[PDB]
Amino acid sequence: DKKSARIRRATRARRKLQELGATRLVVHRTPRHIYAQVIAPNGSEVLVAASTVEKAIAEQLKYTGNKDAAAAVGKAVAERALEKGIKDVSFDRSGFQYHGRVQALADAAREAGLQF
Amino acid sequence: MLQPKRTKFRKMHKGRNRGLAQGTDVSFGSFGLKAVGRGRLTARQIEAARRAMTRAVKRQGKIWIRVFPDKPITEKPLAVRMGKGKGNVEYWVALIQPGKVLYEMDGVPEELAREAFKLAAAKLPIKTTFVTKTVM
Amino acid sequence: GIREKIKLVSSAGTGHFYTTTKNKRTKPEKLELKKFDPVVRQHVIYKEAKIK
Amino acid sequence: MKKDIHPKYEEITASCSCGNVMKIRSTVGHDLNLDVCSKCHPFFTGKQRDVATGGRVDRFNKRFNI
Amino acid sequence: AKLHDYYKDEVVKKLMTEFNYNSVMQVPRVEKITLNMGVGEAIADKKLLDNAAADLAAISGQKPLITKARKSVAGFKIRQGYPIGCKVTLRGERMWEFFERLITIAVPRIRDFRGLSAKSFDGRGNYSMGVREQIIFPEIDYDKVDRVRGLDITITTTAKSDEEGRALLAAFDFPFR
Amino acid sequence: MATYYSNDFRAGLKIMLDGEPYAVEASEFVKPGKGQAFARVKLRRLLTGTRVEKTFKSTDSAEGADVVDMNLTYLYNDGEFWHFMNNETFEQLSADAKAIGDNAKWLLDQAECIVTLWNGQPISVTPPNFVELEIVDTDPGLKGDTAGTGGKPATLSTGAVVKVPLFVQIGEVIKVDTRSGEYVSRVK
Amino acid sequence: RNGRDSEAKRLGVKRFGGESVLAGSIIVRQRGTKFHAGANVGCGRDHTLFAKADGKVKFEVKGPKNRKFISIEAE
RNA sequence: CGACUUACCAACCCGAUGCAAACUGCGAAUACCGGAGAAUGUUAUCACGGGAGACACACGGCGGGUGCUAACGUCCGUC
RNA sequence: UCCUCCUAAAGAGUAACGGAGGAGCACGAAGGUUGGCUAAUCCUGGUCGGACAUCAGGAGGUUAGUGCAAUGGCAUAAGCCAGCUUGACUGCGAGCGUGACGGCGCGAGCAGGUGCGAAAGCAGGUCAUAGUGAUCCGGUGGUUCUGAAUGGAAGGGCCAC
RNA sequence: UAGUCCGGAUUGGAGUCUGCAACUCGACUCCAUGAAGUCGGAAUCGCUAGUAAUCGUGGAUCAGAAUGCCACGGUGAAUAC
RNA sequence: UGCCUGGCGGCCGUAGCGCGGUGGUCCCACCUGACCCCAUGCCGAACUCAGAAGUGAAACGCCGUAGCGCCGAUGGUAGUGUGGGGUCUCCCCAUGCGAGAGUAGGGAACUGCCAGGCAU
RNA sequence: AAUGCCCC
RNA sequence: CGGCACGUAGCGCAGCCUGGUAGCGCACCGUCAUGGGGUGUCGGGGGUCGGAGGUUCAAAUCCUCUCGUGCCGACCA
Ligand SMILES: [Mg+2]
Ligand SMILES: [Mg+2]
Ligand SMILES: [Mg+2]
Ligand SMILES: [Mg+2]
Ligand SMILES: [Mg+2]
Ligand SMILES: [Mg+2]
Ligand SMILES: [Mg+2]
Ligand SMILES: [Mg+2]
Ligand SMILES: [Mg+2]
Ligand SMILES: [Mg+2]
Ligand SMILES: [Mg+2]
Ligand SMILES: [Mg+2]
Ligand SMILES: [Mg+2]
Ligand SMILES: [Mg+2]
Ligand SMILES: [Mg+2]
Ligand SMILES: [Mg+2]
Ligand SMILES: [Mg+2]
Ligand SMILES: [Mg+2]
Ligand SMILES: [Mg+2]
Ligand SMILES: [Mg+2]
Ligand SMILES: [Mg+2]
Ligand SMILES: [Mg+2]
Ligand SMILES: [Mg+2]
Ligand SMILES: [Mg+2]
Ligand SMILES: [Mg+2]
Ligand SMILES: [Mg+2]
Ligand SMILES: [Mg+2]
Ligand SMILES: [Mg+2]
Ligand SMILES: [Mg+2]
Ligand SMILES: [Mg+2]
Ligand SMILES: [Mg+2]
Ligand SMILES: [Mg+2]
Ligand SMILES: [Mg+2]
Ligand SMILES: [Mg+2]
Ligand SMILES: [Mg+2]
Ligand SMILES: [Mg+2]
Ligand SMILES: [Mg+2]
Ligand SMILES: [Mg+2]
Ligand SMILES: [Mg+2]
Ligand SMILES: [Mg+2]
Ligand SMILES: [Mg+2]
Ligand SMILES: [Mg+2]
Ligand SMILES: [Mg+2]
């Protein structure tokens, strides 16, 4: 039910983003992995997804659940988005504290170009 | 003398008494006294009918009182003008619609129940009738 | 009716002032806040004072 | 564990009359002398002497008889 | 940590062969030992509560949390929000150190120890017990102390029933009986 | 200072009629057949402490006053003034000779005595009903030929004089009722 | 000891379903959020749902709790 | 200090039966708001200006409060 | 005089010396923001301790709570806890609601200048509805706007008890 | 200078003796237990010298059963205007 | 493409509970450890951080099951608009609308985007 | 030269 | 009828305003004094607020309803 706790933590900001109709960048941090994907303002369709389950990153990395891996997948997702033409998003920490791995992903994305 | 132990509010609107009745099935006992008319029974009339029927069966069998006076009826005093707030509660009443079974009884033969209900109904302002239990 | 009203005079040298109420009994210490002062269009500290 | 909040907590030696030495971390500060530890307490050879049931007719016939 | 190593090496396999467990994760393991000292006299004297807190910080290795009146009860002239207790949670190496200290020093030192109950077990395995004098812990000295306090221990386990919790403490040769 | 009307105030109110605080003790409202209504109030002058009788007109009326009473505790006397304090606000306060009239001999120290203050200022203090006091002076009682009880005059550490039975000597604390000025017991 | 009612507050729905609406016009006046705000509509400090764009009012029943939603179809 | 017997009362739950203007896990007919269309209607609609009167109503039907489901009673809504 | 429910006839409104209750405030945090948390009550085990304190677990599910009456609402919590703060800002205001009128209420958005947040953003008081008194007359501070020949001033005006 | 190495009441256990017989109801001994009591309210009592105060001893009664009663000595005062 | 698993939805109980069974290659969860980032009104419990020895026990997912919950009739049985009538406090007739509860039954959800393993 | 009542 | 102000130990009264303790006098119990009774002295005990329901953490106290006892008038017709 830690799941339900953090989902309740996320729900408010998620619905505010829903209402503002902004393209939101969501993360989802597990112990052994970290994910990211930008989802169209309607919320049902996803634009680009970058994850540390992908071989293209899992090979370059040494351990998957740590801050440098988070920065790597953040770089990956911001690059894929900017290539697809998306450059203005909003960050949806999806319940996790904006700190450590998630903050690292966010800084890497900001650095790679995603204005938010 | 039946009367609610507590009520949320002391006085109640007059209201109307339209429609048929709800508890129109003899369920508990084997015979019942179904009302055919329509009006309002009082706690006094209910108690009088109960006394009549229980004495007629001589403390035998089991009876049920399927109605309960919850409506508080109020009256103004005498020689008082017509304004100046609602009255004050005098007695309690149970509105009756056609078909509402009033009393129930089992454990006594059918004819003895007939007589007991006759002696009871002779003290009720509503026209009533005897009804028996039915399957389904 | 225990809650008197006060004026928060500006510390920007003007005579501008707001006006609110304070419970003089439980909070005897003066009220100091930073409110917008429109005569100089800055946020300056405001120090309370008597209505007079 | 915060820094200045909690008290000192160091490894302290505890010696009993059972002849058992025990290295324990505790707040006692100095060394420690025990009188009774777990292994010496009269708990497993005491459940009879700490009740003392006995029998009065036995006491009587031992006191005297026919 | 001596008792913890002992647990990991003997007790897990002993409980395995005892209860015919299939996964090692099934074996009951303790999680926290909670220490509580409810000082009702604190509303009369707060310095009493402070001294109780100090004694608890002595008995354990941690500063205690000052519990406060959840509700306002007139039967004891406590108003909601009053500081009336102390609490210490012990997890990990601190829990194991206090557990060892307890069952090896304090239980033998308690006055007229004829054994602890085998039926104070919450029905859910979690054991709890109480002491009547805080001097039974060698950390505090009876010439230094002024008032004799008490407290109660609470051994929370992941035992489904209480039979397996008691069997766990027995594997730890807890001195209850 | 909400103005009060005659057929409104019952006992307990502190009316302020004619630059002077009062205190309604009793009041009888009358509405006779065919005439203006009135109230016969049994007022109480709250400064000299005399009970005045006033028949008030339905219409005739008066403003209220800040006369209030609560439990102050005596501290000390200095010159012509008596100082007391609260146990729930700890607000300091000073009275005068007029307020403490004839209760000077009843208050010792730390006595918890109800005081009436008006305009945020005391006007009358009420000594606790029973006060423990010590006797400064007495004539060693000698029964002599007394056949009845006899009694004996005895000054106290605060100047007062009370009749004490016969045995109370000097340095014995007694208990007196401020209300009657009389001996109750010798507190051991 | 009675007869002290209060002034009627004129709550209720002001623009019903499928009704053209300029931005800033009240749709419902209420006490609590009996109707919640949806697309292009706001929620005042006293829970009056107003319009934030022009278009046609629509009433919805979306939600996991089966709540009532006011939305504006921006036409 | 422990207690043994048992003609009464019985909360909480479970089954069954009713009641409510200030009860609602349901819920119409009408009425009300908005849009579209044909026919009809001496613009019947709205705005601005000149002139008013009137603001004691009554009874009959329908929905009610009060009264006694009394009054050619009384107070409302609608015709 | 004002607020809440019913009467009130499923839009709004609707009377009676009809049925029930409340208000004439409180708060500089009980406001703003960011982060986090989820109750009442029962059962069991537990030092004094007990019907009921504090501790632990379980069942339960918002029967709890909301500064204050009742109604509607509240879990994204509007409830509870903590950090930083003063948006309890100034000038306006598309457009609506509600009034015979005096008026009263809601409000996105613009400009200046702040607060919290990494940011998206939120903030011109408080879950909402009671907590109030028109005009005259006069007081206080500001302000060149006027100032009875002229320069001042008195006194008026404009802005904020 | 402490409810104490004061006080010994009460109670548990174990015994001795007298006596047909120590349960109701003896006395004494041993071990343990260690109440109240920190100089005593109004009132009240005895005593003028080997007296009061204090310390022991014996006897009658009597198998056993006295802190009572009757005697004996040891130390030995204050005051009487 | 077929099945598995993650996230974000759509929908808001025919979608939820309960009982039985089952899942660890991957994913997930528990897990290991704690100087460092960070944290406890005490507690690495939680929140974090550094990892991968063990386990699917708990949780989570999935399959089954009709003990509940839930849905629910075409269709048949109260009220009511309009007109008329009566024995008029309450009903009837013509006409239009037509429930609530209950019955038969249904029911162990359906689906969109993008991501990781066997066949192809 | 304070008080001091009564006894079927 | 209303309004209204009472109901607290055996009796008579306080308290209540401004919530957290129930007080005062007489009486009552046991000594003492006395030949004995009384006066007197020394000590002791006793109630929980007519009742019920609310507000509250908590009600003698605050609200509301009941029961009982007093007081005022229930007039112009
Ligand atoms: Mg009926
Ligand atoms: Mg202001
Ligand atoms: Mg458990
Ligand atoms: Mg209804
Ligand atoms: Mg209507
Ligand atoms: Mg025309
Ligand atoms: Mg006109
Ligand atoms: Mg009319
Ligand atoms: Mg009649
Ligand atoms: Mg309406
Ligand atoms: Mg009208
Ligand atoms: Mg009022
Ligand atoms: Mg939040
Ligand atoms: Mg308990
Ligand atoms: Mg509730
Ligand atoms: Mg808030
Ligand atoms: Mg406008
Ligand atoms: Mg509010
Ligand atoms: Mg005027
Ligand atoms: Mg004038
Ligand atoms: Mg002026
Ligand atoms: Mg000029
Ligand atoms: Mg001039
Ligand atoms: Mg001027
Ligand atoms: Mg001594
Ligand atoms: Mg002898
Ligand atoms: Mg003692
Ligand atoms: Mg003599
Ligand atoms: Mg002589
Ligand atoms: Mg002698
Ligand atoms: Mg002798
Ligand atoms: Mg002899
Ligand atoms: Mg001698
Ligand atoms: Mg595995
Ligand atoms: Mg962890
Ligand atoms: Mg690995
Ligand atoms: Mg159904
Ligand atoms: Mg049908
Ligand atoms: Mg009809
Ligand atoms: Mg149906
Ligand atoms: Mg299932
Ligand atoms: Mg006589
Ligand atoms: Mg006349």
Q: What's the per-residue H, E or C state across chain F? A: CCEEECCCCCCCCCECCCCCCECCCEEEEECCCCCCCEEEEECCECCCCCCCEEEEECCCEEEECCEEEEEEEEEEEECCEEEEECCCCCCEEECCCCCCCCCCCCCCCCCEEEEEEECCCEEEEECCCEEEEECCEECCCCCCCCCCCCCEEEECCCCCEEEECCCCCCCCEEEEECCCCEEEEECC
State the residue range of the domain holding A14: 1-116
- Give the containing element (helix H, strand E) for B40: strand B39-42
E175 and D38 Cβ atoms separated by less than 8 Å: yes
Pick the CATH number of B21-136 from 3.90.1170.10, 3.40.228.10, 3.10.20.30, 3.65.10.10: 3.90.1170.10
Q: Say how far apart CA F75 and CA F90 lie, in whole Å.
A: 12
> What is the stated resolution of the deposited model, in angstroms?
3.1
Please give the angle made by the CA atoms of A42, G64 and A6, to the nearest 5 degrees.
Answer: 75
Determine if residue D16 is labeled as part of a ligand binding site. yes
Q: Are residues D41 and E113, on separate chains, in Cβ contact within 8 Å?
A: yes
CA distance G53 to G38: 12
- Other residues' Cβ atoms within 10 Å of the Cβ of residue E83: 16
**Contact predicate B104/B29, CB 8 Å:** yes
Beta bridge partners of E154: E34, E128
- Which residue in the set D2, D26, D47 is minimally distant from E101, CB to CB? D26
Neighboring chains of D (3 or more beta-carbon pairs < 8 A):
E
Nearest nucleotide to B88 (CA to C1') is I19
Rounded Cα distance between F165 and E8, Å, is 86
Question: Which residue type occupies F27?
Answer: S
Residues of D in contact with E5 (CB under 8 A): none
Domain ranges in chain C are 1-51
Q: How far is the CA of D45 from the C1' of J23 (A)?
A: 40
Residue type, F186: R
Q: For E3-172, which CATH superfamily applies?
A: Ribosomal protein L5 (3.30.1440.10)
What interhelical angle do B110-121 and B43-57 show, nearest 10?
150
- Answer whether any strand I atom is within 7 A of the Cβ of G68: no
For residue D37, what are the CA distances in angstroms to D42, D45, E116, E130, E173?
Answer: 10, 15, 16, 19, 14
Question: Which method, experimentally, gave rise to this model?
Answer: cryo-EM
* Residue of chain E nearest D4, judged by CA positions: E63
Separation between Cα atoms, residue F67 and residue F14, nearest integer Å: 6
Virtual torsion, Cα B90, B94, B98, B101, nearest 10 deg: -140
- The CA distances from residue E115 to D19, D35, E135, in Å, are 23, 19, 19
Q: Closest approach of chain D CAs to the CA of E75, in angstroms?
A: 35
Residue of D nearest to E176 (CA): D43
Residue with tokens 């429109």: C38
Residue E100 with chain D: CB contacts under 8 Å: 24
Q: How many domains does chain A have?
A: 1
Q: Which of D2, D5, D38 has its CB closest to that of E104?
A: D38
- Beta carbons of D34 and E104 less than 8 Å apart: no
In CATH, what number is assigned to the domain containing residue A47?
3.30.420.100
Strands (E), G1-75: 12-13, 20-21, 26-29, 35-37, 49-50, 55-60, 68-73
- Contact between E101 and D26 under an 8 Å Cβ cutoff? The reply is yes
CATH 3.30.930.10 for the C1-51 domain, yes or no: no
Helix (H) or strand (E) holding A48: strand A46-51
Centre of ligand 28 to C-alpha F156, Å, is 37
